[PDB]
Amino acid sequence: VDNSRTRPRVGHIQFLNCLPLYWGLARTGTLLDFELTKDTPEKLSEQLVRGDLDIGPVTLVEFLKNADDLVAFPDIAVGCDGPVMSCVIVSQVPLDRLDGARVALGSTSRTSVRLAQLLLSERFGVQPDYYTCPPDLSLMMQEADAAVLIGDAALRANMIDGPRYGLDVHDLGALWKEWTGLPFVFAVWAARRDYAEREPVITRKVHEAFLASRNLSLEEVEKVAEQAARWEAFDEDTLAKYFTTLDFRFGAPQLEAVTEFARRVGPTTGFPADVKVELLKPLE
Amino acid sequence: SRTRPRVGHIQFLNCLPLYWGLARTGTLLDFELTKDTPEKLSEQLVRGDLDIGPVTLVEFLKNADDLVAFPDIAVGCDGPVMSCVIVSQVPLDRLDGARVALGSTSRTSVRLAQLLLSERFGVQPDYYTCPPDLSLMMQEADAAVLIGDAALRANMIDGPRYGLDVHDLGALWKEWTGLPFVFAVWAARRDYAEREPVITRKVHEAFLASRNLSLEEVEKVAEQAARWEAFDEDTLAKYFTTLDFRFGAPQLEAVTEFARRVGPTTGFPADVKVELLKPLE
Ligand SMILES: C=C(Oc1cccc(C(=O)O)c1)C(=O)O
Numbered sequence: 099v100d101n102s103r104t105r106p107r108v109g110h111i112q113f114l115n116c117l118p119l120y121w122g123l124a125r126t127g128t129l130l131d132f133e134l135t136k137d138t139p140e141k142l143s144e145q146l147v148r149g150d151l152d153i154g155p156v157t158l159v160e161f162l163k164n165a166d167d168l169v170a171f172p173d174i175a176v177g178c179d180g181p182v183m184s185c186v187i188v189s190q191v192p193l194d195r196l197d198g199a200r201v202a203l204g205s206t207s208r209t210s211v212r213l214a215q216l217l218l219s220e221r222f223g224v225q226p227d228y229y230t231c232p233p234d235l236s237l238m239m240q241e242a243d244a245a246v247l248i249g250d251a252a253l254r255a256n257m258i259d260g261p262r263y264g265l266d267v268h269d270l271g272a273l274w275k276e277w278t279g280l281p282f283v284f285a286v287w288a289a290r291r292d293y294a295e296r297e298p299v300i301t302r303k304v305h306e307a308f309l310a311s312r313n314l315s316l317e318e319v320e321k322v323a324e325q326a327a328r329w330e331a332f333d334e335d336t337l338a339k340y341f342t343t344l345d346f347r348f349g350a351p352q353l354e355a356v357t358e359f360a361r362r363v364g365p366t367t368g369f370p371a372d373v374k375v376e377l378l379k380p381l382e
Numbered sequence: 383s384r385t386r387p388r389v390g391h392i393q394f395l396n397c398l399p400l401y402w403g404l405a406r407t408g409t410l411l412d413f414e415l416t417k418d419t420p421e422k423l424s425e426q427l428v429r430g431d432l433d434i435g436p437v438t439l440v441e442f443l444k445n446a447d448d449l450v451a452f453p454d455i456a457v458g459c460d461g462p463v464m465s466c467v468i469v470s471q472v473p474l475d476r477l478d479g480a481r482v483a484l485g486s487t488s489r490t491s492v493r494l495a496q497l498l499l500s501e502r503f504g505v506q507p508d509y510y511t512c513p514p515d516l517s518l519m520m521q522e523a524d525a526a527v528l529i530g531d532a533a534l535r536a537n538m539i540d541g542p543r544y545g546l547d548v549h550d551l552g553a554l555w556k557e558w559t560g561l562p563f564v565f566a567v568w569a570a571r572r573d574y575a576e577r578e579p580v581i582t583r584k585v586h587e588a589f590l591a592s593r594n595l596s597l598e599e600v601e602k603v604a605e606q607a608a609r610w611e612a613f614d615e616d617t618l619a620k621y622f623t624t625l626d627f628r629f630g631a632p633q634l635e636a637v638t639e640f641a642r643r644v645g646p647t648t649g650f651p652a653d654v655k656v657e658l659l660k661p662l663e
């Protein structure tokens with residue numbers, strides 16, 4: 099029987115927002131310490147919660163609903179301070195005309211759709227008729243007055259489709275910034291609590307390798323954008339702007355934003371407004 | 383917009399150094415990579431789920447009109463290969479009429495094993511395909527043909543522990559013919575190679591560059607990989623340096639002779655043509 103130690107099963111968001119991180123993981127050789135699974139953020143959250151992964155990215159709302167069973171990694175997250183570029187409301191009408199209107203919510207999103215609902219309800223005071231559908235701007239704009247998108251589809255709407263067809267595109271990071279002055283965290287990295295307690299060292303090594311890979315990806319953002327531009331509808335300048343607009347930090351100012359958002363949506367989402375975010379402790 | 387080529391990659395240790403090279407060079411970010419066992423990756427490439435990938439030799443020969451092989455990279459050996467074995471509780475000349483389990487992930491080594499047992503040792507066993515599991519196989523058969531990590535484990539660990547004979551298929555072929563052996567090649571679908579000659583060529587050159595780097599850094603790869611395997615650093619470095627990743631004239635010589643000896647009993651012409659990706663003139 100092969101009872102040797104097993105590589106941690108690690109999720110990775112397939113979208114462009116984590117493409118520089120993937121570059122870092124590859125260049126550092128970290129990938130060879132992982133059994134990597136790539137997918138969309140809602141699938142990766144399901145897999146980690148149900149035990150198909152040991153460590154991975156968790157969209158914030160799903161992390162908070164499972165906070166007792168997950169341990170978040172400090173100093174890395176998928177966030178913004180102001181615009182995030184890839185979490186948007188695309189609308190054919192001004193936001194204040196959306197009361198009773200149809201608003202399509204992309205099915206891959208858990209956090210941005212809730213942030214959009216919070217903003218529309220509690221900031222602009224409109225109550226639209228929401229519905230979930232697969233992310234497809236063309237179909238959404240044929241059947242609804244507005245749509246909430248994330249990931250590459252949202253970046254495409256923001257940078258290409260929106261300007262082409264004269265559609266308003268509202269940046270959810272900027273809308274939240276205007277409303278609260280705060281940055282925003284859309285997704286965190288976490289280990290399952292049982293995996294973190296069974297393998298504290300591997301969990302720590304995975305965490306440190308993520309930080310190192312993230313740091314390298316920041317230094318080489320131009321090389322990453324140059325390479326990725328050959329395979330995307332976005333050009334090199336757009337991708338480098340995107341990669342540098344994203345904020346991958348996760349310290350005290352970012353936790354402050356998570357705390358406030360969790361408070362405003364917890365009771366109507368599925369977790370306490372004062373839900374406890376447990377962070378992976380460093381070696382003392 | 384242009385789409386990344388869909389590229390297969392054998393999940394076994396034999397291509398872990400190559401994966402290291404693909405990551406370190408950044409080549410991985412030009413691929414949409416799929417990892418699986420060699421028989422699955424071969425099926426996927428033939429049926430169009432991949433554009434470029436490793437193809438176990440026998441399956442390449444059965445589909446040679448529709449595949450274009452990459453020169454100067456392959457999975458082979460010159461003598462022992464370490465991870466393609468016959469594990470037997472009896473000497474090979476005592477296997478006539480006995481049950482021999484063929485690991486289901488193999489297409490080439492199982493045929494090479496059959497060729498050796500019939501035409502070199504002159505025994506005709508009762509073959510059957512089953513999942514690779516040395517323990518279950520040794521309870522249900524007198525011998526078993528294994529590849530990949532399972533074969534490497536049998537050769538380096540399980541065999542010596544339980545006193546089981548383990549025959550290296552590369553060495554048996556070398557003894558019989560004096561030739562090296564090629565177990566798998568890399569190929570592009572012909573339709574993909576003709577639609578995207580530049581991408582196909584860049585993928586090929588990136589594979590060569592990554593392979594070369596993996597040879598240069600074999601020790602770091604072994605040190606890292608040993609932390610996740612039952613094999614230690616010295617065993618992995620020995621394995622990685624015993625594998626022969628070349629694919630030039632002497633290796634094609636071996637493919638030609640093997641194809642000749644098994645074609646009529648496998649499912650392709652004995653003189654099947656191996657088309658190679660041509661470099662830019
Ligand atoms: C930066 C983004 O923000 C995210 C990331 C992951 C999940 C979600 C979600 O809404 O569930 C949002 C992006 O999508 O690019």
Ligand SMILES: C=C(Oc1cccc(C(=O)O)c1)C(=O)O
Nearest residue numbers: 438465488489490491529530565
């Ligand atoms: C070096 C090996 O040889 C192979 C590689 C790929 C496929 C096959 C097969 O038999 O189909 C054999 C190994 O398995 O490690």
